[PDB]
Structures are given as C-alpha cells and as structure tokens.
Amino acid sequence: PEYQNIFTAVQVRAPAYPGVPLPKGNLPRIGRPIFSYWLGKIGDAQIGPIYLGLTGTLSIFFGLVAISIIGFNMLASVHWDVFQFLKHFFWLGLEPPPPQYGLRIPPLSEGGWWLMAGLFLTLSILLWWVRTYKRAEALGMSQHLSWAFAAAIFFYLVLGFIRPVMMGSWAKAVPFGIFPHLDWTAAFSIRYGNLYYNPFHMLSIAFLYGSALLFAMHGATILSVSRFGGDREIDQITHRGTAAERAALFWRWTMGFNVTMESIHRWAWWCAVLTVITAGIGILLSGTVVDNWYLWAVKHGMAPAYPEVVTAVNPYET
C-alpha cells in the first residue's frame, strides 16, 4: 500500500499570507483571510484576501446587473410565484428578441431585457479580462492567462454577438437559461444540417477530449512523482530533479517520446485554447458561409455511404 497524496491527512497552520506586495497605484487588498479545515483536506485552507480596484468593481457591477435581469425575468415568467420558480428553474429563461426587431433595440416587454443582459454581461466579461491582465502585470508575470481568456471570450462573442450581427438578428443569439440554452445548442445543429459534419466542430472535440486526456496524464504524472517533490514545478523547471526525469522517462518508455516539465504546460495551454478557437471559427462559419454542414461534407467527399435498408417516398415529389 502507499500514500496516494489525494487528501492531506495532517494539516498545519500559519498566519494568513497577505500576498506579494503590489506596486504603487494598486489599491490595498480587502478581506480578513479565514481557514477552512475541509478545503484544507484537498488543497489550500486559506480563503482571501482579494484585490478589487476600479476594473473589478465595474466588472462586478455590470455582472450583477446582468445576472439579476435574468433571474428577475425568470421569476416574472411564473408570475412571481417563488415555489414555481424553484419547480421550473432549469426550464426558465430570458429569451432573445423576436425576429421582427432585427438588430434594433427591442421593447422592454419583448426582448429589451435580453439585449441589456447580453450588453452588461459582455462588458462585465471584458472588464474581467482587463482584471486578469492587470493582476499579472502588478506581480511582474507574463500574460499567458489573459491570452487564453481572450480565446474563450472570442468564442462567447461569436455565439451571442458577432454571428447574430452578421446574420442580421438578435433572435439568432443564445437564451439565458439552463435547459433553454441546451435547446438552442441542439436546434443550432438541426438548423445547420448536423454539426457533427462541421470540421471545426470535430477539431474542437479533439481538443476538448485532448484537454481531459492531457490533464489526466499530467495530473496523474505529477502526483506519481509528488513523492519526489514534483508538484513544485518552478524549481523542477529551473533545476531538473529526479521528479522531472522520472516523469519524462515514464512517458518516453510508454509512447516513445516525452516533453519537459515546462513544456507540458505549453502543450496543455494550446490544447485548451484551441478548443475555443476552433469552436468560435466553427460557429462563425455556420449560416454565414455554410448553410448545411452535411451537404458541405457530401460536396467535399467526406460523408460515409451505407447500404440502403430504409427509405421514404417524398410526398412533396408525389
């Protein structure tokens, strides 16, 4: 038997860390840090403090307005009945404007609230991006996180803004709601002739599966060498230890090649980022360029053919 290093058996405590000092112009951090024993079983027990300047304050204000507008409209759609709101919660939604309004600001009673939530959520997200950028800058760190966040924002923007504008209608954007946004996902594939045959859909799946493959591989690899301090990746990168050597040899002997402690994190970065780049491109091309992905795949010779064992007379022909 052995310690698997999944749970911390014996936690230690020290006075809360207030954080690396920030340069002049940053505001003081806020919150008195607390400790959670149960979080300390799986990870760090400290909660807080947090940074909150103008960028994040504006981000949070826009975002709470957006979220409250959604919830308000969900509750209004069951006539203020809180019990029915809980019953139907997963079904309720804030609906995009009707097609008759195009891209014009639609009436408050029939789509204006959707347009405001999308505007204010979008500004909230863009300001959160600036926040991730500023927080790296104040610590003297490079901007890898904000670049990847921008790739996810690209996909989000394509779904609700860029494609609807290109297609001339807010009615073609996404509803805010649990099951309603799943309806939208399935209906989009139906409308555009089966998203399985979109080649950027295929790529996005390869990269989403690949992200889970790579974090399973890397997560497990690092825990198997945590007995050699391999979780301390900074000093394994500057000063290669037997953790990094055994990790690379496990993979070289398994599959013939290997990476380094630093460069596995580059493979991981690109795999995750390409998931949402290809996803944005795939949706960006749907409706604007390709109207039926299956027929696009037939045209380029990709769709499998099967022996005919069922078939139907077209009554529009008859």
Binding site: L203, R240, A248, V259, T260, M261
Partner: peptide, 22 residues
Amino acid sequence: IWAFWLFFFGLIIYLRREDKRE
C-alpha cells in the same frame, strides 16, 4: 480548414523544439 492545418503543423514543430530543452 486548410489554413488551420498549416498553423497546427507549425505549432507542433514549435512544441517539439521546446520539448528538447532537457
């Protein structure tokens, strides 16, 4: 999609170089 393949194979070669720093 062809433009993507050109980018992707360029990316793989970049990554394999980084992999050879140890």
